[PDB]
Amino acid sequence: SITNVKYLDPTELHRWMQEGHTTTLREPFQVVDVRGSDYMGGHIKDGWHYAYSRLKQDPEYLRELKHRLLEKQADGRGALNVIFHCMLSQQRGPSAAMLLLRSLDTAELSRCRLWVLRGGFSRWQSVYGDDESVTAGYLPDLWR
């Protein structure tokens, strides 16, 4: 085998956002921010917020996230690039990716490409925070 979750750099996600799709295959993507208590202060524009603490405790919440991702994929070309992140993408981001992975059948996983955003929202804001076109709800004072 090879692996079914990989890292994605903020610079790549940013390019995809600028271009409207992944660059090479022109595939759709969807950011999933899994922060709970530290979500405030900014998030990536157009991402979905499903706190990992709830996804892990609430099976219907995980089902909803999976449904929503599969539905979006059915509407687009190729595989849907799902990008999980939390604050650092060290614990919650990767755990949430694996929680979704475990819930995907073979047919469903082949419809997706699963990513963790390297560095989390912390790294994202450091270069992209101020740009309201890619970052929603940025509170620069929260980062002093």
**Which residues of this chain interact with Cl ion, rule CB under 5 A?**
48
Pick between residue 70 and residue 101 the one whose CB is nearest to a copy of itself: 101
**Is 75 or 144 the residue whose CB approaches a copy of itself more closely?**
144
Cα gap 42→30, rounded to integer Å: 17
Calpha distance 59→82 (Å, rounded)? 19
Q: How far is the CB of 111 from a copy of itself (least distance, A)?
A: 15
- Judged by the rule CB under 6 A, the positions of this chain that interact with ligand [N+] are 98, 101-102
- Judged by the rule CB under 8 A, the positions of this chain that interact with a copy of itself are 1-9, 36-41, 87-88, 94, 98, 101-102, 109, 116, 122, 125-126, 139, 141-144
